[PDB]
UniProtKB/Swiss-Prot annotation, chains A, B:
The lineage of its organism: Viruses, Riboviria, Orthornavirae, Pisuviricota, Pisoniviricetes. It catalyses: TSAVLQ-|-SGFRK-NH2 and SGVTFQ-|-GKFKK the two peptides corresponding to the two self-cleavage sites of the SARS 3C-like proteinase are the two most reactive peptide substrates. The enzyme exhibits a strong preference for substrates containing Gln at P1 position and Leu at P2 position. It is found in: Host cytoplasm; Host Golgi apparatus; Host nucleus. The gene is rep. Inhibited by pyridone-containing alpha-ketoamides compounds 13a and 13b. In turn, alpha-ketoamide 13b (tert-butyl (1-((S)-1-(((S)-4-(benzylamino)-3,4-dioxo-1-((S)-2-oxopyrrolidin-3-yl)butan-2-yl)amino)-3-cyclopropyl-1-oxopropan-2-yl)-2-oxo-1,2-dihydropyridin-3-yl)carbamate) inhibits SARS-CoV-2 replication in human lung cells. Inhibited ex vivo by michael acceptor inhibitor N3. Inhibited ex vivo by compound 11a and 11b. Residues 1-306 form the Peptidase C30 domain. Residues 1-306 are cytoplasmic. There is a cross-link at K5, K90 (Glycyl lysine isopeptide (Lys-Gly) (interchain with G-Cter in ubiquitin)). Changing N142A: Does not affect ability to cleave and inactivate human TRMT1. Cleaves the C-terminus of replicase polyprotein at 11 sites. Recognizes substrates containing the core sequence [ILMVF]-Q-|-[SGACN]. Cleaves and inactivates human TRMT1, preventing tRNA guanine(26)-dimethylation of tRNAs. May cleave human NLRP1 in lung epithelial cells, thereby activating the NLRP1 inflammasome pathway. May cleave human GSDMD, triggering alternative GSDME-mediated epithelial cell death upon activation of the NLRP1 inflammasome, which may enhance the release interleukins 1B, 6, 16 and 18. Also able to bind an ADP-ribose-1''-phosphate (ADRP). Changing M49A: Does not affect ability to cleave and inactivate human TRMT1. It comes from Severe acute respiratory syndrome coronavirus 2 (2019-nCoV). Changing Q189A: Does not affect ability to cleave and inactivate human TRMT1. This is 3C-like proteinase nsp5.
Length: 306, 306
């Protein structure tokens, strides 16, 4: 029993983190085979950030302008290129600890583990969700750029996020590992702000199923509702609409607990309208939306990785 | 900016987990140098648990009754002994991935990372605190026994917890790595229940400092209080008393924010008496007590490990 914000084991990723220095700027890089991936803003000075032409900035660099360190070993940079907003540094040595991996662009609502790093050295791991407004609510300090987000599927590391910047509201923005930003953000210092965020409805329902599995039943009721009646209520409270695909995804949890999805929706509708009234669910006094249906299955069934 | 429930990177510990089978029971073991540590209840059958004599049970086993697997390699057991409630299996091979490590018995209020494992394989990592009643609020399923809790200090892994059992309220009990239970629990199936829990006051104050560092100031006020006036209020709300040592530990956070500890205490006193009134702090609608002062410093200053 029990339910925690659980991250993936980070060992396979720790062995791929390196330090990258260009000029006075040091941040983190991801070393896979003979390529080091890092944010391209590493090549900028303070004067360039207002409107950088990255093609010009890169053509004026040479391979020896890039200092790449793996622990105490210096890696020799033999090539460099740019893909969207990531820099790819080719090095003379293939990382012997390269895991089986793939690169994946995730959707809002999905969750992943972040390995927060400073100077190439792992500092901590935590779980977060890609919000509907394409930011993440992370924890990052100076020097954390190039830290990556990932999932593990059996034996395979899926990299989905590389950290680039913090926005004025204190939330975070970055790219997939092919250098495409999530959301409307760009790597030039111009006025940018996150759009309004919404609550990830399918995840709240997953978490209410987790509560039932763990013995929290006080919010259940005998009613049922329809998708369209539920969604009319969800919209008013700034919740994402529920689709038939969401219903199907929750199937395994409905089956294990015996409570129909549309039954659970009537409970959520009541909680939205009357509040939780000084009660808690799974130790929380707010409805939690950063667990996917798969997170709940994994943690309430016991899936491992090799 | 930002603030998350952050666990330590787990790579150094993943390489020490093995699977241990005795009879029909399989659980996890910790392989360091040429010794595998695991809960001694692995040697029990269902009939023995009501009142096991572990000395008798162990004398009737031989080295080949213990099946120890590291991935796909079988490790050959060449000796076995018991230390308190842990079994130590001597094996013919020293773990080449043994980190620099030590064994530490922690105090209530301290936090640590748990690497949850099934069949020797890491499943997830999360952070928790050893409660004042010597339980932890973990997340564990069948087969998780022998999963360990740890901290990292520079380059050294400090093991502090090995998982043995779940109590009827859904919380968890285990031993240090020398086999001594935390709390009044014993490994015989008899009626046992956790004592009443209290809230870890010094940790709540640390977390209120974290909130200030991240821009949540609405709960501050101009007042100050005394230790003895604060503690009189804390007692009524089932909070641990605050000592002068607690005050000193919070020094670094007081200094970075400019708010005296006893100033912060007057804010907490107000929050206890009037509630948070539908407001949140660091995204929570309850006062959080599972971050130590050191956790906050580490996450709001950026300490890494090598
Ligand atoms: C990366 N090592 C570091 C991580 C930051 C520090 C605090 N929290 C974090 O997540 N980020 C940077 O160095 C980054 C460089 C940069 C500047 C400008 C642009 Cl457009 C990009 Cl894509 C990257 N700086 C910042 O994140 C910066 N924020 C902004 O400048 N944001 C706007 C205004 C461009 C939206 C600070 C947080 C002010 C350092
Ligand atoms: C270990 N692999 C497993 C982990 C459990 C499963 C569910 N959640 C967990 O944390 N634990 C056990 O196999 C354990 C064996 C055992 C039995 C009896 C005693 Cl005294 C000890 Cl120290 C260990 N069983 C249990 O944890 C058991 N709980 C109790 O029997 N608890 C009391 C009544 C002895 C307090 C179940 C949770 C019922 C399986």
């Amino acid at each position: 029993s029990g339910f925690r914000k659980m991250a993936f084991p980070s060992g396979k990723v720790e062995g791929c983190m390196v330090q990258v220095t260009c000029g006075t700027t040091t941040l983190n890089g991801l070393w896979l085979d003979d390529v080091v991936y890092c944010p391209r803003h590493v090549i900028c000075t303070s004067e360039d950030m207002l409107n950088p032409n990255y093609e010009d900035l890169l053509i004026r660099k040479s391979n020896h302008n890039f200092l790449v360190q793996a622990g105490n070993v210096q890696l020799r940079v033999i090539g460099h290129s740019m893909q969207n907003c990531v820099l790819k540094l080719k090095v003379d040595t293939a990382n012997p600890k390269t895991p089986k991996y793939k690169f994946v662009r995730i959707q809002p609502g999905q969750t992943f583990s972040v390995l927060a790093c400073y100077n190439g050295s792992p500092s901590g791991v935590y779980q977060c969700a890609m919000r509907p407004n394409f930011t993440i609510k992370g924890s990052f300090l100076n020097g954390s750029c190039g830290s990556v987000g990932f999932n593990i599927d059996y034996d395979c590391v899926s990299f989905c996020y590389m950290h680039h910047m913090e926005l004025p509201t204190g939330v975070h923005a970055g790219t997939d590992l092919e250098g495409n930003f999530y959301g409307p953000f760009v790597d030039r210092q111009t006025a940018q702000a996150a759009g309004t965020d919404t609550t990830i409805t399918v995840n709240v329902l997953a978490w209410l199923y987790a509560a039932v599995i763990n013995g929290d039943r006080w919010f259940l009721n005998r009613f049922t509702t329809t998708l369209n009646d539920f969604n009319l209520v969800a919209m008013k409270y700034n919740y994402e609409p529920l689709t038939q695909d969401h219903v199907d995804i929750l199937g395994p949890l409905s089956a294990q607990t015996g409570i129909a999805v549309l039954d659970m929706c009537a409970s959520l509708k009541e909680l939205l309208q009357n509040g939780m009234n000084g009660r808690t669910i799974l130790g929380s006094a707010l409805l939690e939306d950063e667990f996917t249906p798969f997170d709940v299955v994994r943690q309430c069934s016991g899936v491992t990785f090799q």
